[PDB]
Design a protein around this ligand. Structure first.
Ligand SMILES: OC(O)[C@H]1NC[C@H](O)[C@@H]1O
Ligand SMILES: OC(O)[C@H]1NC[C@H](O)[C@@H]1O
Ligand SMILES: [Mg+2]
Ligand SMILES: [Mg+2]
Ligand SMILES: [Mg+2]
Ligand SMILES: [Mg+2]
Ligand code: NA
Ligand code: NA
Ligand code: NA
Ligand code: NA
Lengths: 1016, 206, 204
């Protein structure tokens, strides 16, 4: 029993050795259940041979594996506690989760890890029925252990496993016994596998996926592969199933493979074991390949996820079933042909998103309910594809993508981003065996899933020779799927697809050995023929996705630009609790974890509770599967579906005259895949009232699907129709002149202009003051994450917009009053002001204003702003005040219900919108400028009305409080309502978040700016 | 040539097509290239010998091509013209006569060059099996090598007899083969395929 | 000293495991001599930093590694003989060389080999000069061991290596000492590497 002791087992230090990635681990294979009934395998009822050991386990934490006492191998520690498995122990409070982006969470010294290596000792007492031990093989399956583990069963050492994202299986048949058994699993946080696991995410550990017992017979199906081959029009398919057995070869042994659609058995084949001759020595006597013909197979795609059920029966020749396994089959062909990625002969347009396995309460433990919620929200927002950034996911994810319809990029668990250079391990042949297991065990596990259309070699590990080797391995073992890999410049020999991250549409980024060309330019480089699909683009950090429409214009125009994957789906925030019990969303170093990279873990289109950010609707609109063109009275609808007719689609059109509905109709969509339908609108009513006529169309799905409710809107578009400019024509306000102020009286109302500051300082309706803070020019915004331009907390970009604004003194600039006079017209009063904003004797901005207060109570405000050409272009040019009112609703005529910016407004529509005031504040976890609505012609808040042509936001948080507060839960509502009305507002960028990404036409660079506003 | 031969497996690629054996095969290839890549006499790398064709061969072929592009890679196994070789390198393909074995045929070397889509040079990794009184028909090979440009020669099997010396009861040494040491199963005199005897005296075929 | 014992070291059965082809082996590299003079390196004169340990070693043959007594890790066996290294022990008469062409010399059951696995225990007492231990790195280079081997230095386990045709190198700097040292090398005839070594030749 000496060899089973912790003193012996821990002495080799197998977690500091890339030549040992496992000990005694069984071979990888597709998902097994070991059905002893073929009907149960066909219907996928729960197999009694596959036992789940999830639930209550005993757990003890130790600061290093040497601190684990030897008695834990035999009996449960008295100090151990009861915890749910699967879990990450950092979510139970045992040590802190660490958020680090690039910098490794340990000292870089491969293959060594720290001696302080946090060790979770899990144990489980469990009964095994005696019928499992008298015959067959009982194996234990750990679907995911982070990051390395030793395994004991009844005090005897079983084996060791690495790779925290693929299953580790061990034969327990010689270790179990009848009656009470006990597992002891020692999980190490850091190992040499941690050098291959430097993904930009929370660093957690534990038994975070399922643990299961699987009982198989001794003569068993050990592997099976399903291939589908087609003719050129996909009207005849051959299903090729290769089945491998382990155990005694008998001449009576048979395999039947049956293919089922719903309830009808479509194809069957029965054959004894024995492959065709392979080489000079012969063929595999323990394999058999069955070929089943399928005539007119229902093809699989993300649009129509047609699935068959394949059952693989191992049975004797007189018909006795030994064991069945099964899998869903999707008939589809994925191929790159003439530079295009085709699915079933048609060129794909990838509407993709990257998705980490993240839950804000459970950390990295995935459950079916969250997986289904993600898939439904993805399909409801017009995504058709997901990248498994950056590891093999939970096995249920691929099943759900098979059934709901998403294309999957399945990615090996290899990221060595913190190395210097990035390929230091991936170009080293000593690390080729460790990398080879992360790739080969992923392909052996997931190769039968139809949703997986592309293999990825990993992420951000440079380009080494190990990548070229493993690329060629996958191409030899599974030619049915392209291989991609971004690292080392996105176009190496290790990728079938040019797959850059954050390459811009039009702008080159000429980095020295790994340049990011503009994606249009990249396609035509000499000798370049591959399709281009961005593995990451449109970095959705906070208020982002500016310029998203430029990508989708480029994807639609260029055939070899076949889309990309947005970074990314869900914010990686975690929940913490304040002292009164209130939960709040935490990022980076909120757990004492250092070094950390702060809010850079939150790059999602949705919050961690899966509530959408405002960027998601921009993603839905640009990715919509119907495209629209308005000739004159005709709407031309174009289908971007490849495979399905528009059989669940109803076009609704509406014509409104500045919010007011004038006409509306309904038209069923009848458009073939990639076809067009012309829809002639009726005779619209040419109105008499001034204003702009607007036509809005929306495609609704009248029937529910598996992923959407009845009435789901899938696409929309708005156009300006005819405009009729108004040419209609409209007491006398009294002007008090004191030495300190100008006061204008009309009726009950008063306007007060501070003659020393030059600003409108107070307004009176009745007896009540309307302002808490004077109406003042504003040239700054509380900086977005794109403005801040940081991806690593230790490195500041001096070209970042917030660095340039701060160094120029935009946030510190002081207004110098140049002019403030008052003149009494014969129908109004005119206040004229001029201000200069200066920082250290440099005039940044000059603002010239006229306030015209007429007898009708209106205040016409005209602002002309000059900006120095040598100052950095300001984030906004507008006005800002603290209204004394706190009203419940905001009502206004302008773009979209949701938040929209000049860079991100295509999803918004012009209409009359009316939301609660909380809806006008977007609660980004890192607070910034938010809630802007562009294109606004009228804004109503309480008794106030502003008209003109402006952008606004309105909320109870000033820009100063937003800029100074690191978390949304630390915001406090200020006493009135902060109103920001902008003539002009900079774009938000988002091509990436760590460099300047606002395109030049979205910057406020004109130098002189004019806007007019009417307050009533 | 890498130290990889799995000839006794059934089929021959049972280990070389298994990714569990990819780390062991990868060390036999990568440690050979790291040791010998500066020698000018080494002009071609070989992935081993008689191990079928598996995906591990394709992987290690591509590894060598990435790490050392200055030398072609060849590998005979799995039919002498797989994706794991830069050179058509059959063993004992005849000059004019096809040998149409079912999945690994040995075409005549003249015919092999002109098969549709075949463009590589052909160099026999083994030919003219010099077992005993042999090398009959050797001139037919060298006529073919001189006439055809892509027939760029080959490697005779082989240089030296693998006989071992034993001693009779009076002390006289004698050349022993196969099962002369009680070793069993053996393959008898098949270890002696040399152009020269084990003491390096030439056979007449030399 | 429990972890250095034959009962612990042989219990993982690293010669029946294709996932373990070595333990603690240094990286491969081109041929080195570590000249401390550039003129000697240019003319390829023999470097005094590269020491040859070929010559007389002590050798004991055992029918399996389990039959090796634990005392061999500390002192030379009295029944051990003095044999020239490098050599193949079948040429010294200790067991028979096997000539098999295609058929493996053991039962085909990878990665397992026979329990009757002929084991050559080599040892060498050798002096190390004290200037090698005060600074620098002293490594041992086995240019060829057939087919697998465990290595002890002064009774401490050093590492393991397979592939009988490439050099296996191990850092000995923490294991050596001034004065008499002793290597103990346990060479196994069959290992999982033997499945990759089925060349048509004598099996030695
Ligand atoms: O490849 C991805 O994991 C990384 N690219 C930028 C993103 O924020 C993440 O750090
Ligand atoms: O490839 C060589 O090793 C083998 N081919 C035939 C020769 O006699 C030998 O057995
Ligand atoms: Mg390890
Ligand atoms: Mg990274
Ligand atoms: Mg081994
Ligand atoms: Mg052979
Ligand atoms: Na395109
Ligand atoms: Na990030
Ligand atoms: Na020639
Ligand atoms: Na021979």
């Amino acid at each position: 029993m000496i060899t089973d002791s912790l003193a012996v087992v821990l002495q080799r230090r197998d977690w500091e050795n890339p030549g040992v990635t496992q000990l005694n681990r069984l071979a990888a294979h597709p998902p097994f259940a070991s059905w002893r009934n073929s009907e149960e395998a066909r219907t996928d009822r729960p197999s009694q041979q596959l036992r789940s050991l999830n639930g209550e386990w005993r757990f003890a934490w130790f600061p290093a594996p040497e601190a684990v006492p030897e008695s834990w191998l035999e009996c449960d520690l008295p100090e151990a506690d009861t915890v749910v498995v699967p879990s990450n122990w950092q979510m139970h409070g045992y040590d802190a989760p660490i958020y680090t982006n690039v910098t490794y969470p340990i000292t870089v010294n491969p293959p060594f890890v720290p001696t302080e290596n946090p060790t979770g000792c899990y144990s489980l007492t469990f009964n095994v029925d005696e019928s499992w031990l008298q015959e067959g093989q009982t194996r234990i399956i750990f679907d995911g252990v982070n990051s390395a583990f030793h395994l004991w069963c009844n005090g005897r050492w079983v084996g060791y496993g690495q790779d925290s994202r693929l299953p580790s299986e061990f034969d327990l048949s010689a270790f179990l016994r009848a009656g009470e058994n006990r597992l002891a699993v020692m999980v190490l946080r850091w190992s040499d596998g941690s050098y291959l696991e430097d993904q930009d995410m929370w660093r957690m550990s534990g038994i975070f996926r399922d643990v299961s017992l699987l009982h198989k017979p001794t003569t068993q199906i050990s592997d099976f592969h399903v291939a589908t081959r087609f003719n050129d029009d996909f009207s005849r398919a051959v299903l090729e199933a290769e089945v491998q057995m382990c155990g005694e070869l008998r001449d009576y042994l048979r395999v039947t493979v049956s293919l089922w659609q719903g309830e009808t058995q479509v194809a069957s084949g029965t054959a004894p074991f024995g492959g065709e001759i392979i080489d000079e020595r012969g063929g595999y006597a323990d394999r058999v390949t069955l070929r089943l013909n399928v005539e007119n197979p229902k093809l699989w795609s993300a649009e129509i996820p047609n699935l068959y059920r394949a059952v693989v029966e191992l049975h004797t020749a007189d018909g006795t079933l030994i064991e069945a396994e099964a899998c869903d089959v999707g008939f589809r062909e994925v191929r790159i042909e003439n530079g295009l990625l085709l699915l079933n002969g048609k060129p794909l347009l990838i509407r993709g998103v990257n998705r980490h396995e993240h839950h804000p309460l459970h950390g990295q433990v995935m459950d079916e309910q969250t997986m289904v919620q993600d898939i439904l929200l993805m399909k409801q927002n017009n995504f058709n594809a997901v990248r498994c950034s950056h590891y093999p996911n939970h096995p249920l994810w691929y099943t759900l993508c098979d059934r709901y319809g998403l294309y999957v990029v399945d990615e090996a668990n290899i990221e060595t981003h913190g190395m210097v250079p990035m390929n230091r391990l991936t170009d080293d042949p000593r690390w080729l065996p460790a990398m080879s297991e992360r790739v080969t065990r992923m392909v052996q596990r997931d190769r039968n899933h139809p949703s997986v259309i592309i293999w990825s070699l990993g992420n951000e590990s440079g380009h080494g020779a190990n990548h070229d080797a493993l690329y060629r391995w996958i191409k030899s073992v599974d030619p049915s799927r392209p291989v991609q890999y971004e690292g080392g410049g996105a176009d190496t020999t290790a990728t079938d697809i040019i797959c850059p991250m954050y390459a811009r549409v039009d702008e080159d980024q000429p980095f020295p050995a790994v340049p990011k060309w503009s994606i249009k330019k990249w396609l035509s480089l000499p000798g370049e023929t591959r399709p281009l699909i961005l593995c990451e683009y449109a970095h959705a950090m906070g208020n982002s996705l500016g310029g998203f429409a430029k990508y989708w214009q480029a994807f639609r125009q260029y055939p070899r630009l076949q889309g990309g994957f947005v970074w990314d789906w869900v914010d990686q925030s975690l929940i913490k609790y304040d002292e009164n019990g209130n939960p709040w969303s935490a990022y980076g170093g909120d757990f004492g974890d250092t070094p950390n990279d702060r809010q850079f873990c939150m790059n999602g289109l949705v919050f961690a509770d899966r509530t959408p950010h405002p960027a998601l609707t921009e993603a839905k609109h640009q990715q919509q599967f119907f495209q629209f063109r308005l000739s004159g009275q005709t709407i031309e609808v174009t289908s971007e579906y490849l495979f399905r007719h528009s059989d669940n689609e109803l076009l609704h059109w509406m014509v409104a005259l500045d919010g007011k509905p004038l006409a509306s109709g309904e038209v069923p969509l009848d458009v073939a895949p990639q076809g067009k339908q012309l829809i002639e609108l009726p005779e619209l009513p040419q109105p008499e009232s001034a204003g702009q006529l607007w036509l809005t169309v929306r495609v609704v799905q009248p029937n529910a699907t598996a992923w959407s409710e009845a009435g789901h809107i899938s696409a929309w578009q708005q156009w300006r129709l005819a405009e009729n400019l108004s040419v209609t024509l409209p007491a006398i306000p009294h002007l008090t002149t004191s030495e300190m102020d100008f006061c204008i009286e009309l009726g009950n109302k008063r306007w007060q202009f501070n003659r020393q500051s030059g600003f409108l300082s107070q307004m009176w309706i009745g007896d009540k003051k309307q302002l808490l803070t004077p109406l003042r020019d504003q040239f700054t915004r509380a900086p977005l994450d794109n403005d801040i331009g940081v991806s690593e907390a230790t490195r500041i970009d001096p070209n970042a917009w917030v660095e340039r604004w701060k160094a120029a003194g935009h946030y510190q600039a002081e207004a110098a009053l140049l002019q403030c006079t008052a003149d009494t017209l014969a129908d109004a009063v005119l206040i004229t002001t001029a201000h200069a904003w200066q920082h250290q004797g440099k005039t940044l901005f000059i603002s010239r204003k006229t306030y015209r207060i007429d007898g009708s109570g209106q205040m016409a405000i005209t602002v002309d702003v000059e900006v120095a050409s040598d100052t950095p272009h300001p984030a906004r040019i507008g006005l800002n005040c603290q209204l004394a009112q706190v009203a419940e609703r905001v009502n206004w005529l302008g773009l979209g219900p949701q938040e929209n910016y000049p860079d991100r407004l295509t999803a918004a529509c012009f209409d009359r919108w009316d939301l609660p005031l909380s809806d006008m504040y977007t609660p980004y976890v890192f607070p910034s400028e938010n809630g802007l609505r562009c294109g606004t012609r009228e804004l109503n808040y309480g008794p106030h009305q502003w008209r003109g042509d402006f952008q606004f936001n309105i909320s109870r948080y000033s820009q100063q409080q937003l800029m100074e507060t690191s978390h949304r839960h630390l915001l406090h509502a200020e006493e009135g309502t902060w109103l920001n009305i902008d003539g002009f507002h900079m774009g938000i960028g988002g091509d990436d978040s760590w460099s300047p990404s606002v395109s030049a036409e979205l910057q406020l660079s004109a130098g002189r700016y004019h806007y007019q506003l009417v307050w009533c």
